[PDB]
Design a protein around this nucleic acid. Structure first.
Ligand SMILES: [Mg+2]
Ligand SMILES: [Mg+2]
Ligand SMILES: [Mg+2]
Ligand SMILES: [Mg+2]
Ligand SMILES: [Mg+2]
Ligand SMILES: [Mg+2]
Lengths: 136, 102, 66, 214, 149, 132
RNA sequence: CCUUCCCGCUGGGGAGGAGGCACUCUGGGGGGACCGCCGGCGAUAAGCCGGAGGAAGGAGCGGGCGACGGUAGGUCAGUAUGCCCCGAAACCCCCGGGCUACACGCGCGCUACAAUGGGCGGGACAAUGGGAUCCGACCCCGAAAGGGGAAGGGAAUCCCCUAAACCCGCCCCCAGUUCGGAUCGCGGGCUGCAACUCGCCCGCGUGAAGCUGGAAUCCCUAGUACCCGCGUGUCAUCAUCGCGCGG
């Protein structure tokens, strides 16, 4: 028994029954590397399937995600290190992540910097040329 | 007895050979033991320019080359031998270098 | 699978043919069937040397040319 | 392989790949018999040494010609299965070790099936995949006619091997079947002379087009 | 019997399994994290990759003798997918192999020539040749043409 | 201590073989031929041995040091070197002729080398050219 | 030959010293291949073909040297040079910007659209070239990029330099996916006087089109093409480029 074709981890982001690390990459803010980290620190097998995940294991990786560094994750393996309002080095997930992106962008816009301007016009801003190969 | 390395380098095999024959014939004039003219790998300085100033037209290249032939000779260091190999003519397009192994 | 094909041995190469030079006119001699020695001239595609054997689905076509 | 004896297979007899013999192998097409090399050649690999001449192909082993045709990269300038294939970097071009293993796995496959010498199977397949007549356009007095012509045995071989390999390629392209399996399937299908084989089909079509052209 | 007599990969896995029984071969706290190099894309998928890596290094030091970290770096490196850009060769990180070498010097298997790198000890080559003769037997059940050697 | 040295060359690969009386052991860079991991390379190296036969190999021991380009070039250079070694060890011309009709390049070398690359898209080749 | 270390089945393996140039290699001088021999075709000639033998077989293979002359072809923006002009500005130097802008059209290419594969871990095998404020082994620090110290090396002595494609095992099993890596966020570094405009690198994260491509078109005849990576030139730092190297 103990099978579930679908599993909710970090809310109701709902994950298939493939192996767990890739199921977790199904979340925004989690790649396969951060996933493997989280599972190694939580003692879970990454090759394990998600249907055989127990609610306490769910809780465990959820709380790791809530405070990764406190559990053994390094500070150089996180979405948002050295945040612009709290020097805490933290890892952000779906909604908080899009909000953080939005906020830093529109901070730049508020101060009317090149990146903010170039964001709001939807053009490249990391040194590209845009003449021959950015056409939409 | 301590030995003397003579590293000599040129762009002309014939000047090079002239010097080595000078050394051979002088050592056998005396009786000091030569170590042959060991030929070392010759350096090919290659420079591949484009032969056009215009930048127009088909691209064509000049592969210019300079060749440096190198020999080394080890001969036992005697004051006589050393004096006379110093007296050697050492033509203009050649470099030499007498190190001594002791 | 080998249907009613008739072997034929190549005895002499003649000029090459074809709009693009891929074809070779050749003289061949049947080996089996009823002819059993009737030479004939055929237009063969591909490389040939004398002694080669080409098998024909017929024998009464006989293309000719110089 | 995952048996360690197939991984460190040691040859002793001068069989082909040290596994299959050719003494018992026979070709009933007399036009192909000279041009099919079946020597006791352990390693098929030749190192190009034949191409510089005009019939070194005749002097070359047959499974070598197969693996060389299997070193394919699909179809780049023509459409097999209606499709350009155009594997560029994930091809086997210049990878004869991979091609060798592909062919070897194919042979093992069919011999697990087919209870036969796979080289016998292969010669049957090229025999009943090899056409006899083709068509080409010739000028007579300045006017073009799509005439029919007979095909030389070397060219017959070339086509047979080519389109065997090409059928394997089309069947392995973008689907779950392996190249080796496609190859096995193609060879036994053609040897049984069923139209499921790309090669038999292609032979039949060029031949019926010829018999239409005369 | 010896290292040159048997193959490499089998030997590395066997001697890794055996190195788990050595106490100076603890992984460092940053192992479950980091890749093996910038040329890689993903974390190692195994848990005992540390032991596999030090086993490999041990064998490499057996074979190539007075060798050091930069040489091993270029051996443990490889190709990188540089995106849309073409592929190039990149060396690996040095910390893995350094910590490994230091663990091995602690366990007694390698020593550190003042210059020209690190050198296997007698107890080390004994360790490796023991595992090799064992392996050779187990695959001499197979190839007797290898029983020969 | 009758030992015989032979050499083989194949496009930037040089093998130096030494042959002597022994048991049948043949080693490429300290490694048995038996365990050489690409089957093709193993078979290139083994062809002369299979062809000559166990009857003499089992009395021969060989060691090859090969210091060149690729695994295939190394294998061919080794094949050459040991073929020559066997022939010069045995003085058997029936064997020489067996080799020379199986593969002449087993005893004579392959003389081919790579053609120097020429300007237009030179990195690719001497005849490989840019697109028009 | 000497000394030493391991397996152990007591058979075998490696390492360092003299040993000597054997083998390889290097580089000077010679030789060797000439359709020379056999046969055939062409005319019996010129010569072509097949074969033998040979390392090499048909100008051996590959390059360099580009005739007289034309092209008002390109270059006075490399130098040289006539005329015209500027000539205290159209001369010289400095700061900053720009040449890096982007609704679009085109050329050449890189990466892909996956299993003729992707990832992880293990295992292998090169050559060409280059090195003085330059290569930098080796040690230590660091997760990485990188940082500190530093042997030797003005070059067959040292270093760059244990390549990748390949192989073995394990996950993935035909799907916008463990394919693809555009884009973007955060952080950490190197070069430089300066990194915003506008550099390169690393780590976490994001996860764009794209599921083989019409008409039409390009390159290539043997160690060639395709595939794989490397070196060097440019270079303070920058290589999807050029010239080259091998697999
Ligand atoms: Mg000549
Ligand atoms: Mg003009
Ligand atoms: Mg003009
Ligand atoms: Mg990917
Ligand atoms: Mg698909
Ligand atoms: Mg450029």
């Amino acid at each position: 028994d103990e099978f579930r074709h679908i599993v909710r981890i970090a809310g109701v982001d709902l994950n298939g029954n493939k192996q767990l690390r890739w199921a977790l990459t199904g979340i925004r803010g989690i790649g396969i590397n951060f996933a493997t980290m989280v599972l190694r620190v939580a003692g879970i097998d990454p090759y394990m399937k998600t249907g055989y995940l127990t609610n306490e294991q769910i809780k465990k990786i959820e709380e790791i995600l809530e405070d990764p560094v406190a559990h053994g994750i390094p500070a150089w393996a996180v979405n948002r290190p050295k945040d612009y309002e709290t020097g805490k080095d933290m890892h952000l997930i779906t909604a908080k992540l899009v909000m953080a992106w939005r906020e830093d962008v529109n901070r730049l816009r508020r101060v009317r910097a090149y990146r903010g301007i170039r964001h709001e016009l939807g053009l490249p801003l990391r040194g590209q040329r845009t003449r021959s190969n950015f056409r939409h | 007895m301590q030995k003397a390395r003579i590293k000599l380098a040129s762009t002309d095999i014939k000047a090079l050979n002239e010097v080595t024959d000078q050394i051979r014939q002088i050592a056998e004039r005396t009786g000091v033991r030569m170590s042959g003219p060991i030929p070392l790998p010759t350096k090919r300085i290659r420079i591949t320019t484009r032969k056009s100033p215009d930048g127009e037209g088909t691209a064509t290249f000049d592969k210019f080359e300079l060749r440096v032939h190198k020999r080394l000779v080890d001969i036992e260091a005697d004051e006589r031998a050393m004096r006379q190999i110093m007296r050697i003519r050492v033509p203009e397009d050649v470099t030499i270098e007498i190190e001594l192994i002791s | 699978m080998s249907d009613e094909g008739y072997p034929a041995e190549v005895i002499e190469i003649v000029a090459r043919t074809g709009v693009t030079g891929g074809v070779t006119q050749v003289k061949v001699r049947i080996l089996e069937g009823r002819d059993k020695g009737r030479v004939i001239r055929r237009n063969v595609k591909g490389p040939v040397r004398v002694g080669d054997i080409v098998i024909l689905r017929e024998t009464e076509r006989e293309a000719r040319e110089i | 392989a995952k048996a360690l004896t197939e991984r460190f297979y040691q040859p002793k007899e001068l069989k082909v790949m040290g596994r299959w013999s050719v003494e018992d192998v026979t070709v009933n097409d007399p036009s192909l018999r000279p041009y099919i090399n079946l020597e006791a050649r352990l390693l098929p690999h030749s190192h190009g040494r034949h191409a510089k001449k005009a019939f070194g192909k005749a002097n070359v082993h047959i499974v070598e010609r197969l693996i060389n045709k299997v070193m394919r990269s699909g179809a780049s300038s023509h459409k097999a299965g209606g499709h350009f294939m155009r594997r560029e970097h994930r091809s086997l071009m210049s990878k004869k070790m991979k091609a060798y293993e592909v062919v070897k796995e194919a042979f093992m496959i069919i011999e697990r099936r087919t209870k036969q010498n796979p080289i016998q199977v292969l010669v049957r397949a090229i025999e009943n995949s090899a056409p006899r007549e083709d068509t080409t356009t010739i000028a007579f007095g300045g006017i073009r006619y799509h005439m029919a012509v007979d095909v030389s045995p070397l060219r017959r071989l070339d086509i047979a091997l080519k389109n065997i390999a090409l059928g394997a390629s089309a069947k392995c392209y973008r689907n779950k079947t392996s190249y080796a399996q496609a190859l096995a399937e193609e060879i036994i299908a053609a040897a049984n002379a069923d139209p499921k084989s790309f090669a038999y089909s292609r032979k039949e079509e060029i031949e019926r087009i010829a018999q239409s052209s005369r | 019997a010896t290292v040159y007599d048997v193959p490499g990969d089998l030997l590395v896995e066997r001697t890794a399994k055996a190195l788990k029984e050595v106490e100076a071969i603890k992984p460092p706290e940053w192992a479950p994290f980091v890749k093996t190099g910038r040329h890689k894309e993903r974390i190692p998928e195994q848990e005992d990759w540390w032991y596999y890596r030090v086993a490999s290094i041990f064998r490499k030091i057996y074979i190539d003798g007075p060798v050091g970290i930069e040489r091993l770096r270029t051996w443990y490196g490889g190709r990188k997918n540089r995106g849309h850009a073409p592929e190039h060769f990149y060396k690996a990180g040095g910390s893995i192999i350094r910590k490994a070498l230091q663990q091995l010097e602690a366990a007694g298997f390698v020593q550190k020539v003042p210059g020209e790198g690190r050198i296997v000890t007698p107890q080390g080559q004994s360790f490796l040749d023991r595992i090799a003769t064992e392996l050779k037997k187990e695959l001499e059940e197979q190839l007797p043409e290898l029983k020969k050697y | 201590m009758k030992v015989i040295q032979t050499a083989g060359k194949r496009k930037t690969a040089i093998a130096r073989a030494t042959i002597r009386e022994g048991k049948g052991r043949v080693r490429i860079n300290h490694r048995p031929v038996e365990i050489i991991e690409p089957e093709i390379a193993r078979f290139t190296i083994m062809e002369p041995l299979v062809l000559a036969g166990e009857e003499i190999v089992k009395g021969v021991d060989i060691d090859v040091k090969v210091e060149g380009g690729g695994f295939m070039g190394q294998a061919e250079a080794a094949r050459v070197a040991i073929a020559r070694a066997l022939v010069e060890w045995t003085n058997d011309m029936n064997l020489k002729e067996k080799f020379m009709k199986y593969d002449r390049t087993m005893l004579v070398g392959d003389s081919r080398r790579t053609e120097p690359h020429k300007p237009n898209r030179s990195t690719k080749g001497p005849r490989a050219k840019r697109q028009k």
